Amino acid sequence: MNKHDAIQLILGQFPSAYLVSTCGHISRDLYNINDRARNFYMVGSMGMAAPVGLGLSTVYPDVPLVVLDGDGSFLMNMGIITMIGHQKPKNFIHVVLDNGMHESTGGQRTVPLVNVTDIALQVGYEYAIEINSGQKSFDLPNEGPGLIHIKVEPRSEKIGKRVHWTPQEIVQRFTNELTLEN
Amino acid sequence: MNKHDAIQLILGQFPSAYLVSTCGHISRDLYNINDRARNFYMVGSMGMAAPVGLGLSTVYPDVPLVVLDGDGSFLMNMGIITMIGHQKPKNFIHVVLDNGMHESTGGQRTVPLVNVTDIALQVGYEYAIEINSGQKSFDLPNEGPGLIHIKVEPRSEKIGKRVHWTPQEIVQRFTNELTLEN
Amino acid sequence: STAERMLSTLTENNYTHFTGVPCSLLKGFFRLLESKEAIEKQNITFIPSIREDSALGVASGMYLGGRKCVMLMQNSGLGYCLNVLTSFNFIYDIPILLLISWRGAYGNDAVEHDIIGEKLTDLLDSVDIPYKELDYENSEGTILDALFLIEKTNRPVAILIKDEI
Amino acid sequence: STAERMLSTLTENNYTHFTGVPCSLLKGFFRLLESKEAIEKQNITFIPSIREDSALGVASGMYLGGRKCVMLMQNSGLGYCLNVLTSFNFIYDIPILLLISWRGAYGNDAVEHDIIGEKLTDLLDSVDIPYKELDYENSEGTILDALFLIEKTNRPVAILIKDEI
Numbered sequence: 001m002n003k004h005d006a007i008q009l010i011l012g013q014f015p016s017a018y019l020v021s022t023c024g025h026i027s028r029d030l031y032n033i034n035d036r037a038r039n040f041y042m043v044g045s046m047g048m049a050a051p052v053g054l055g056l057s058t059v060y061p062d063v064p065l066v067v068l069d070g071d072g073s074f075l076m077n078m079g080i081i082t083m084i085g086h087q088k089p090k091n092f093i094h095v096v097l098d099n100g101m102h103e104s105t106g107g108q109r110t111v112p113l114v115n116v117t118d119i120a121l122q123v124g125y126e127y128a129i130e131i132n133s134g135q136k137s138f139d140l141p142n143e144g145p146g147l148i149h150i151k152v153e154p155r156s157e158k159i160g161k162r163v164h165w166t167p168q169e170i171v172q173r174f175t176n177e178l179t180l181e182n
Numbered sequence: 183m184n185k186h187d188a189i190q191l192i193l194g195q196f197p198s199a200y201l202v203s204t205c206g207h208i209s210r211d212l213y214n215i216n217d218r219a220r221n222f223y224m225v226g227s228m229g230m231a232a233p234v235g236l237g238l239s240t241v242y243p244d245v246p247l248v249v250l251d252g253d254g255s256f257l258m259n260m261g262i263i264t265m266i267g268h269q270k271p272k273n274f275i276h277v278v279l280d281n282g283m284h285e286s287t288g289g290q291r292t293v294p295l296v297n298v299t300d301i302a303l304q305v306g307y308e309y310a311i312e313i314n315s316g317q318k319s320f321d322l323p324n325e326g327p328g329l330i331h332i333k334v335e336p337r338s339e340k341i342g343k344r345v346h347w348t349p350q351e352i353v354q355r356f357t358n359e360l361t362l363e364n
Numbered sequence: 365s366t367a368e369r370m371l372s373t374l375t376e377n378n379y380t381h382f383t384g385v386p387c388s389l390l391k392g393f394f395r396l397l398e399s400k401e402a403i404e405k406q407n408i409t410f411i412p413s414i415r416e417d418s419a420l421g422v423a424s425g426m427y428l429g430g431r432k433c434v435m436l437m438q439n440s441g442l443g444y445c446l447n448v449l450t451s452f453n454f455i456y457d458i459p460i461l462l463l464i465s466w467r468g469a470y471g472n473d474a475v476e477h478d479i480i481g482e483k484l485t486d487l488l489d490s491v492d493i494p495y496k497e498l499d500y501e502n503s504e505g506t507i508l509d510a511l512f513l514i515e516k517t518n519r520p521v522a523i524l525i526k527d528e529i
Numbered sequence: 530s531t532a533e534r535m536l537s538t539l540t541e542n543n544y545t546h547f548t549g550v551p552c553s554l555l556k557g558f559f560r561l562l563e564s565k566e567a568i569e570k571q572n573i574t575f576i577p578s579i580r581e582d583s584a585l586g587v588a589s590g591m592y593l594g595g596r597k598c599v600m601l602m603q604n605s606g607l608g609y610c611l612n613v614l615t616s617f618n619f620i621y622d623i624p625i626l627l628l629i630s631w632r633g634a635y636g637n638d639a640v641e642h643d644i645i646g647e648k649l650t651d652l653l654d655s656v657d658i659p660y661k662e663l664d665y666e667n668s669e670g671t672i673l674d675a676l677f678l679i680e681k682t683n684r685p686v687a688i689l690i691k692d693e694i
């Protein structure tokens with residue numbers, strides 16, 4: 001699987017959820033595939049996707065929320081998982097696009113991410129499913145927190161287009177849709 | 183069991199070992215129990231005892247060294263357990279004295295440490311044991327890396343004297359012993 | 365006393381959400397935070413945090429939920445979450461009131477606080493983080509000025525605490 | 530070729546242990562580090578790290594084992610490990626050579642590098658951390674100046690890399 005198909009899969013499974021994407025090529029690819037007001041692109045501050053997501057799911061617990069992490073972003077601030085397992089937000093979804101490298105940087109090898117599903121289940125995640133290349137779909141429980149491990153092959157497509165939204169515009173649209181939904 | 187018993191017990195098991203204690207009550211208790219030249223007290227940089235221990239094991243794989251961590255210090259930079267299970271140091275010993283609170287600052291509630299032994303075994307630790315507060319015995323495989331989870335009761339005694347060695351004196355007392363050791 | 369007045373003045377002005385990593389000088393604040401009495405009485409949402417950066421991230425996320433949050437921390441932890449402030453809060457204009465414990469402010473503290481103690485204000489000024497020194501005679505007015513500044517700039521402001529509360 | 534000369538000079542001066550996280554501007558240096566034959570020809574051990582703080586920690590540990598280490602990182606990553614420089618390295622006098630990628634130094638980069646790009650030198654000087662801009666015409670001389678300062682002060686010094694290597 002490539003990142004394009006994985007992002008399209010995640011967007012198809014939850015087309016009515018708010019997403020927080022980590023910095024680098026993941027946010028760029030998400031913005032290029034589908035630009036949504038419910039998408040919060042973190043242009044910088046790597047490793048903060050999951051903390052911001054936990055705060056959002058703390059204030060708005062009923063809303064479904066997806067964190068779009070990579071293997072490098074997940075690993076950099078791994079300890080946050082404990083807090084998530086401690087908070088156990090029922091509608092928190094943790095996606096990890098694992099390509100085994102810092103791709104948005106040049107393809108440098110990351111620390112190998114092993115048995116992510118099991119340790120996710122240990123810290124307090126209600127379910128942690130793994131995805132091999134070619135899985136059409138899967139039915140997931142409506143009660144989280146959840147962890148989705150999608151091992152994606154290195155990209156062959158073009159880098160895409162950088163997100164043109166000013167960070168202030170990103171927070172404006174995100175907050176406005178959050179207020180309009182409830 | 184209190185921290186005195188845990189420290190004395192691990193000292194009895196590994197008398198010729200090198201120690202890297204974390205900042206706070208742990209380093210001071212270790213210093214007051216037994217001021218060893220082979221002890222490296224970290225006065226600051228909370229969550230940085232496991233990194234320096236991993237580096238020491240990297241340069242000196244055959245020498246045995248342990249890391250005195252607390253629940254707070256372990257949780258702060260837990261993310262290094264991945265680097266530990268990736269580098270797989272054979273003589274690395276990981277001690278986590280879980281008192282369930284931030285004792286060195288007033289006993290503030292820490293995030294609950296949950297299933298640490300299983301997570302260690304998943305991230306690449308060769309073994310991991312959990313210790314009951316009643317008995318006194320150490321049984322582990324010779325080859326590591328290994329984690330030792332010890333639940334400790336809140337300290338009944340006073341904190342006692344603080345480390346009098348200056349950081350430079352600690353550095354020299356430790357590095358002289360290491361250089362002569364190998 | 366001082367911690368009670370600070371927390372009361374923050375709660376009256378709709379600052380109810382808290383993340384932090386403790387310090388010796390901020391013990392009373394964490395007492396009031398972890399008190400089951402104050403949580404139900406003052407409507408206090410406190411989230412334990414493993415690291416200052418995760419605390420700041422969760423605080424920013426809670427701000428994105430339409431709530432006003434402050435963050436407690438030892439000044440040493442500023443060297444751990446600084447990147448966040450320089451790559452998120454001041455870039456996205458996400459304000460979080462910072463209650464920093466100024467360890468080593470007088471140079472007689474423990475050795476681990478020597479550098480940060482004498483260089484805290486210089487660090488904040490070089491990196492353009494605005495701060496206010498806690499006036500222990502009128503703490504409510506100091507945090508009032510801090511809240512005024514953050515509402516004027518939509519960016520975080522720190523309150524520096526060097527004595528025990 | 531410039532990163533090649535830097536790495537070769539470091540290894541000739543017995544700097545053989547490397548940690549850190551990648552940056553786009555340090556692409557060639559990480560390619561040289563993760564090369565198995567460059568590992569063999571120069572006796573290099575590269576410890577890939579999850580974050581800047583753990584990288585600097587394992588580098589300090591490897592220094593304590595009689596080795597001489599350097600740590601590469603993006604300038605943003607400074608905000609994640611500055612504490613361990615002010616609470617450990619500059620306290621215990623444990624010197625690590627720092628290759629910091631000065632993102633946003635020209636003001637026309639991505640928004641995430643704006644603050645650090647403007648204030649990297651101000652932040653480094655605010656906590657008495659010596660830096661040195663890379664001389665792309667004589668990159669070996671910059672490494673030599675850094676190593677001379679490291680020897681003289683037994684404290685970590687940094688070099689600032691603003692162009693691609």
Ligand SMILES: Cc1ncc(C[n+]2csc(CCOP(=O)(O)OP(=O)(O)O)c2C)c(N)n1
Pocket residue numbers: 022023024025026044045046069070071072073074097099101102103104105447550551552581603605606609
């Ligand atoms: C502390 C810090 N160091 C470095 C960077 C630069 N950086 C951006 S993305 C990235 C790699 C991200 O890896 P990953 O999460 O796996 O994204 P992907 O490989 O899928 O593109 C790095 C090193 C940063 N933003 N913050």
Ligand SMILES: Cc1ncc(C[n+]2csc(CCOP(=O)(O)OP(=O)(O)O)c2C)c(N)n1
Pocket residue numbers: 204205206207208226227228251252253254255256279281283284285286287385386387416438440441444612
């Ligand atoms: C980044 C950072 N935040 C806060 C502190 C202050 N601090 C020192 S020790 C400590 C708690 C240590 O907890 P733990 O490792 O469990 O020691 P124990 O409670 O068992 O005594 C804190 C919060 C610090 N030194 N560095």
Ligand SMILES: [Mg+2]
Pocket residue numbers: 070071072097098099100101102103
């Ligand atoms: Mg990736």
Ligand SMILES: [Mg+2]
Pocket residue numbers: 252253254280281282283284285286292
């Ligand atoms: Mg503790």
